[PDB]
Amino acid sequence: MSLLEQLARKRIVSLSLKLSALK
Amino acid sequence: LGLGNFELSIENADLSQGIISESSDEKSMKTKISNHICLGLSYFFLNDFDQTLNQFQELLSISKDSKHLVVLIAKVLYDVGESDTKEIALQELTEYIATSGADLLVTLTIAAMSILDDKREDLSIILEELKALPLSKQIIDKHKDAPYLIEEITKRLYRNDTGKQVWQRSAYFFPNNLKVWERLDKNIQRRIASNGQNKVTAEEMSKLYCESKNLRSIQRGMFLCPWNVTAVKALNECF
Amino acid sequence: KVFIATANAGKAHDADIFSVSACNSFTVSCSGDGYLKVWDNKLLDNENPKDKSYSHFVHKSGLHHVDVLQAIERDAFELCLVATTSFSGDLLFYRITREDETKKVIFEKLDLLDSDMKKHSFWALKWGASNDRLLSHRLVATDVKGTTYIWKFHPFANWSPTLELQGTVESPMTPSQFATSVDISERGLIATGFNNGTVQISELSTLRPLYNFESNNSNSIRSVKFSPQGSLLAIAHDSNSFGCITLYETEFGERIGSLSVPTEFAHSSWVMSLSFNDSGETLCSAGWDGKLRFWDVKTKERITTLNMHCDDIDILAVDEHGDSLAEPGVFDVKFLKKGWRSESLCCVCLDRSIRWFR
Amino acid sequence: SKVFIATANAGKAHDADIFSVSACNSFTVSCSGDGYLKVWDNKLLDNENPKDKSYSHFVHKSGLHHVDVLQAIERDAFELCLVATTSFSGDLLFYRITREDETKKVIFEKLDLLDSDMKKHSFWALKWGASNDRLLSHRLVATDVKGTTYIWKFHPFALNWSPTLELQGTVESPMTPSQFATSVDISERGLIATGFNNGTVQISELSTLRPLYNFESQHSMINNSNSIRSVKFSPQGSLLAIAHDSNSFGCITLYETEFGERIGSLSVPTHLGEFAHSSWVMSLSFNDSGETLCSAGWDGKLRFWDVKTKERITTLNMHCDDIEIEEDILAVDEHGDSLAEPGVFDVKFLKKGWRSGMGADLNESLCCVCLDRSIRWFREAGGK
Amino acid sequence: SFEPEEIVALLSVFVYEGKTREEEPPIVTPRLAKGKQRIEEIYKKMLCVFNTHQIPLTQDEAEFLDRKRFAMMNVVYEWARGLSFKEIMEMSPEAEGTV
Structure with missing residues (x-):
C-alpha cells in the first residue's frame, strides 16, 4: 500500500543503516 | 499491454481513468484515449468479455475519429465475430470514408473484409475500384498489397483466370521491386537482391538460395539460416 | 499541325x-x-x-x-x-x-x-x-x-x-x-x-x-533518344506522379533547357516514349495521362496536343490531392518516315487497341 | 597490421x-x-x-x-x-x-x-x-x-x-x-x-x-532479425567481440567480461547508422597480441580494426582474378552469376612461424576462404 | 550537394602540375565544371589580393590559370568509380607515374 495510491482511490538509507549497525 | 500482462494493464488503465475524469485540458485527452485503447485491447485479447470491449471501443469512437484508430477498431470488432460487431465495423469504416475521402489503407481493409465475407457484388465493386488507383496511390504501396488483392479477387470470381497481368504492369513500372519478380521469375529476384541493389534480410536471402533447387545453393541457404524449416526440409529431400 | 486518322484496329x-x-x-x-x-x-x-x-x-x-x-x-x-x-x-x-x-x-x-x-x-x-x-x-x-x-x-x-x-x-x-x-x-x-x-x-x-x-518519390528514366542529325539528346524524367522532358547538347555535355506547359512539367502523368522525325525539328511525347504532345526543338514551345479519349478536338489540370484529371493512356508512340504508308504515327494504347495517324 | 602481401593461393580447391x-x-x-x-x-x-x-x-x-x-x-x-x-x-x-x-x-x-x-x-x-x-x-x-x-x-x-x-x-x-x-x-x-x-x-x-x-x-526488437554469427574472446584481455546482424547490415559490438558491460561498436560510413560491413559479418579473428581484429564480410572485404581506438585501419578487397594459375579462375558460378567480388566465409590468423615460404618466417600470417571456392594466404609486411 | 567521387576528382587540381600538351576532353559531370568555375573565381580574387600588396609569386602560383591543371579530373573520377588501370591509362593524357 502507498499513501498516493490510497489518496487516488479515495478521490475515485542502506549506508545509514550499515553505519548505525557498525557503531 | 505490450509485454502481455493484460490484468495489470487493465488495473493501471482503470486507476488512470479514475484519477482523472472531470479534467478538461490538452494533456487529458491523450491519456483518456490511451486508457480506452488499453482497456479495450486487454479485455478483447484474454478476458473474452466482448461486451466490455465493445462498450470501451464505442466510447473511443464517440470521443475520436482518425484513420488508424477507426481501422484498428474495425479490425478488433471484426475479430470479435458478432454480426452486429461486423456491421458496426463496416458502417463506421464507410462513414469515415465518406467524411474524410479515399485512402489506400481503408480500401485495402474493406477489400480484405469483403474477401473474407464472400460478398460477390462488393467484391466486383472493389475489383473495379482497386484496378484504377492513381499513380500516387501506387508509388506509396511499396509492398504491392493492391496487386495481390487484385489477383486474389480475380481468381475467386472468374474460375481460374490468369491475373499475372497486374504483376507484369507493376514490373514494367517498378522493375527494381523485390515483390513483383516473385510471381514472374525467381532468377531475376535472386540476381537483383544479390549484390546490394536492394536491402534484403538473411532469412529472405536464404529463402532465395534454397528456391534454386540445387545442392550447393541449398547448403548455402541452410548455412545462412540454420533455423529455417524450408531449408532443412529441402536438404533432407535432396538425398 | 494537323493529324488525320487513317486506320484503327481494336482488341488487337x-x-x-x-x-x-x-x-x-x-x-x-x-x-x-x-x-x-x-x-x-x-x-x-x-x-x-x-x-x-x-x-x-x-x-x-x-x-x-x-x-x-x-x-x-x-x-x-x-x-x-x-x-x-x-x-x-x-x-x-x-x-x-x-x-x-x-x-x-x-x-x-x-x-x-x-x-x-x-x-x-x-x-x-x-x-x-x-x-x-x-x-x-x-x-x-x-x-x-x-x-x-x-x-x-x-x-x-x-x-x-x-x-x-x-x-x-x-x-x-x-x-x-x-x-x-x-x-x-x-x-x-x-x-x-x-x-x-x-x-x-x-x-x-x-x-x-x-x-x-x-x-x-520516383525519378526514373523512361526514354532516351538521340537526334537523327546533329548533337542533341532528349531525356524523359519522372517527377512525383508527373512527367518531365529535358534537352541536352552533345560534344559539350551542357543542358539546353526543359519542355513544359503552364500549370517545370510536360505531362500531368508519367511520360513514356519519345521519337524524333526524319529531319529533327518536331518531338512527339507519349504520356500515361493519355495525350500526345508535339514540341518544336528550335523554339522549345509546344506545337500541338492530341486527346485520344475523345476524337473531337492546354493546362496541367490536377485535382485537390495532386492527381491528373485524365484516364491512363498510351504506352508507346512511333514516327514513320516518308513513303512508309499511303509521315505516319503508330500508337499502341492501354485499351488493347492500335491507332494510326498521318 | 597495416600492409598485407599475398603469398599463395589455390583456386577451385x-x-x-x-x-x-x-x-x-x-x-x-x-x-x-x-x-x-x-x-x-x-x-x-x-x-x-x-x-x-x-x-x-x-x-x-x-x-x-x-x-x-x-x-x-x-x-x-x-x-x-x-x-x-x-x-x-x-x-x-x-x-x-x-x-x-x-x-x-x-x-x-x-x-x-x-x-x-x-x-x-x-x-x-x-x-x-x-x-x-x-x-x-x-x-x-x-x-x-x-x-x-x-x-x-x-x-x-x-604411453x-x-x-x-x-x-x-x-x-x-x-x-x-x-x-x-x-x-x-x-x-x-x-x-x-x-x-x-x-x-x-x-x-x-x-x-x-x-x-x-x-x-x-539487439538495436531494436521491431523485427526478428539480428542473429549472432560469431563470438570471440580476446587472447589475453577480458574482452568479447560479438558479430550480429541488423536487418541487412553487419554490426560488431565489444563487451568486457569481468562485469559484462557494453563498451562500444565498430562502424564505418557506408552507402546512416552504426554498421561495420555493408552486407553481413560472417567471421571474426584476433591476432596474437589481441590488438587487431579482422572481420570477414559478405560484401567481399576484409576489414582490420584497432581494438583500443575502435577505428578502422585498412581494407583488403577480394577478386576472382587474384588466382595465380589462370586455369583455376572461377569467374561465374553454376548459374552464371558473377563472382568478381565474392563474399568471405571464414578468416583465420596464423601464428608467427606456422606458415613458411616467400618471406613469411618471422611475422604473422593470415588465411581466408571465399565464395569462389578458393583458399588464400597473406603475410604481414616487416618483421617482429 | 557533391558526391565523394566528385569531390575527390575536383581536388586533383591542387596536385597536378598541368604541364601537358594535349587538348582537354569535355568534363564528365556538370558539377565538376561548376566547381572548376568556383575555384577559378576564388583564385582570380586571390591573385588580385596578392597583386594589391605586391608580393613576389612563384612560377607555379603565377601560371596557375595559364596551365591545364584540370586535365586529370576525369581520370581521378573514373578511378574512384572503379575502372581498371588499363582503361584509366587508355583514357589518360599522361604516363603511369604521373597518375
Whole structure:
C-alpha cells in the first residue's frame, strides 16, 4: 500500500543503516 | 499491454481513468484515449468479455475519429465475430470514408473484409475500384498489397483466370521491386537482391538460395539460416 | 499541325502492349501475352488493318521489347531481322521472309547466343543500322544488373549470321541499378537509362563513358533518344506522379533547357516514349495521362496536343490531392518516315487497341 | 597490421562452398560442402604449387561446415593431432592425423569417442579448448539445435593410445522457449560464451557450469532479425567481440567480461547508422597480441580494426582474378552469376612461424576462404 | 550537394602540375565544371589580393590559370568509380607515374 495510491482511490538509507549497525 | 500482462494493464488503465475524469485540458485527452485503447485491447485479447470491449471501443469512437484508430477498431470488432460487431465495423469504416475521402489503407481493409465475407457484388465493386488507383496511390504501396488483392479477387470470381497481368504492369513500372519478380521469375529476384541493389534480410536471402533447387545453393541457404524449416526440409529431400 | 486518322484496329491483343517498332516494310508489335504480331505498312487505304495481320507465338513469360532491322545486302539480298526480349530475360532474334506464292510471311526463329551469353537476362535493346561511318551493323542490350552489351553483326562469313561481342560497359554507380532504357546514334554514341535517374553516354569505337548526368518519390528514366542529325539528346524524367522532358547538347555535355506547359512539367502523368522525325525539328511525347504532345526543338514551345479519349478536338489540370484529371493512356508512340504508308504515327494504347495517324 | 602481401593461393580447391578453415603448426585444414577434408602443408618451399602438397579424405556425403584442429605434445616425445568436424546431418566426427616415415604422406584414422546415447543429438558448432595452464586436460565444447551447450574432457591415454571423451555437464538456454545456439567459444581463463538467433549472448563459468551474464545486443526488437554469427574472446584481455546482424547490415559490438558491460561498436560510413560491413559479418579473428581484429564480410572485404581506438585501419578487397594459375579462375558460378567480388566465409590468423615460404618466417600470417571456392594466404609486411 | 567521387576528382587540381600538351576532353559531370568555375573565381580574387600588396609569386602560383591543371579530373573520377588501370591509362593524357 502507498499513501498516493490510497489518496487516488479515495478521490475515485542502506549506508545509514550499515553505519548505525557498525557503531 | 505490450509485454502481455493484460490484468495489470487493465488495473493501471482503470486507476488512470479514475484519477482523472472531470479534467478538461490538452494533456487529458491523450491519456483518456490511451486508457480506452488499453482497456479495450486487454479485455478483447484474454478476458473474452466482448461486451466490455465493445462498450470501451464505442466510447473511443464517440470521443475520436482518425484513420488508424477507426481501422484498428474495425479490425478488433471484426475479430470479435458478432454480426452486429461486423456491421458496426463496416458502417463506421464507410462513414469515415465518406467524411474524410479515399485512402489506400481503408480500401485495402474493406477489400480484405469483403474477401473474407464472400460478398460477390462488393467484391466486383472493389475489383473495379482497386484496378484504377492513381499513380500516387501506387508509388506509396511499396509492398504491392493492391496487386495481390487484385489477383486474389480475380481468381475467386472468374474460375481460374490468369491475373499475372497486374504483376507484369507493376514490373514494367517498378522493375527494381523485390515483390513483383516473385510471381514472374525467381532468377531475376535472386540476381537483383544479390549484390546490394536492394536491402534484403538473411532469412529472405536464404529463402532465395534454397528456391534454386540445387545442392550447393541449398547448403548455402541452410548455412545462412540454420533455423529455417524450408531449408532443412529441402536438404533432407535432396538425398 | 494537323493529324488525320487513317486506320484503327481494336482488341488487337488480350494482354497489354508494351512497345511498338516499325520498318520500311511492316509494323511489328509485341504484347505481354507472348504473341508477336506484324502489320502491313503498305496496304490499300480502303481496307481494314486487321485483314493483313500475321501473328506468331514467342514465349510464355511475356514480351515487352521489339526492334526490327531492314537493309539491302550485297547484290539484291533483302535483309529483315527482328529481335525481342521476354519477361524471363531471353533475347529472341527472328528472321522475317515473305513468300511470293500467296503473299505469306515466314516467322523463323534464329539463335545467335552462345551457352554463356544465354545465362543472362536482358531488358532493353535496339538495332544499330549501317551508316556512312562504318559498314557493319551493331546491337546494344541492357541487363538487370545495369550492364550493357554490344555485338557487331556479320551477316555473311552465304547466309551464315554470327554475333561478335565487341565489349561490355558496366553501370556508373555501385551498388548497381536496374538499366531501363538504351539508345544508339548514327554518329557513334550509346546512351543508357536507369531507374535512379542517371543517364550515361559512351561511344562505339572505344567503349569508354564520356558524359554522366543526374536528375513518395520516383525519378526514373523512361526514354532516351538521340537526334537523327546533329548533337542533341532528349531525356524523359519522372517527377512525383508527373512527367518531365529535358534537352541536352552533345560534344559539350551542357543542358539546353526543359519542355513544359503552364500549370517545370510536360505531362500531368508519367511520360513514356519519345521519337524524333526524319529531319529533327518536331518531338512527339507519349504520356500515361493519355495525350500526345508535339514540341518544336528550335523554339522549345509546344506545337500541338492530341486527346485520344475523345476524337473531337492546354493546362496541367490536377485535382485537390495532386492527381491528373485524365484516364491512363498510351504506352508507346512511333514516327514513320516518308513513303512508309499511303509521315505516319503508330500508337499502341492501354485499351488493347492500335491507332494510326498521318 | 597495416600492409598485407599475398603469398599463395589455390583456386577451385574444393568442389563446393568452403564453409570453415582452421590451422595448426604443421598444416591448414579446410572443410567443404562436398564432404571432403583437405590438409595443406604449411612448410612450402620456393616455387611450389600449394595443391602439390595437399591431401584429401572423404568424411560424410552430406557435407561439412565446421572444423577445428588440436595439436599438442602430450608427453616427452608423443605428439597428437586431432581434427573435429560436424556435418549438415548433425554428426560429430573425430580423426587422428599422422604422417608416414618414408613418403611423408598424411594418414587419416577415424576415432570413436561418443557413446550411443550421445549420438542422438544434432550438433552445430564446436571448439577445441587446449590446455592453457587453467587445467591439465583439454576441453571440447559444442552446441546443438535445441540450444544446449555440452562440455567434454579428452583423455588420450588410459604411453598407451586409448582416447576417451568424458562428459562434464550441460548448460541450457537462458530463455523459454529454447532458441538456436549458433556459435560458441572458450577462453584461456575458463569462460564459455554462446550466441543465439534472437540476439542474446550467455556467459557461463567453465569450472562450475553456471550462468553469469545475459546481455542483449539487439538495436531494436521491431523485427526478428539480428542473429549472432560469431563470438570471440580476446587472447589475453577480458574482452568479447560479438558479430550480429541488423536487418541487412553487419554490426560488431565489444563487451568486457569481468562485469559484462557494453563498451562500444565498430562502424564505418557506408552507402546512416552504426554498421561495420555493408552486407553481413560472417567471421571474426584476433591476432596474437589481441590488438587487431579482422572481420570477414559478405560484401567481399576484409576489414582490420584497432581494438583500443575502435577505428578502422585498412581494407583488403577480394577478386576472382587474384588466382595465380589462370586455369583455376572461377569467374561465374553454376548459374552464371558473377563472382568478381565474392563474399568471405571464414578468416583465420596464423601464428608467427606456422606458415613458411616467400618471406613469411618471422611475422604473422593470415588465411581466408571465399565464395569462389578458393583458399588464400597473406603475410604481414616487416618483421617482429 | 557533391558526391565523394566528385569531390575527390575536383581536388586533383591542387596536385597536378598541368604541364601537358594535349587538348582537354569535355568534363564528365556538370558539377565538376561548376566547381572548376568556383575555384577559378576564388583564385582570380586571390591573385588580385596578392597583386594589391605586391608580393613576389612563384612560377607555379603565377601560371596557375595559364596551365591545364584540370586535365586529370576525369581520370581521378573514373578511378574512384572503379575502372581498371588499363582503361584509366587508355583514357589518360599522361604516363603511369604521373597518375
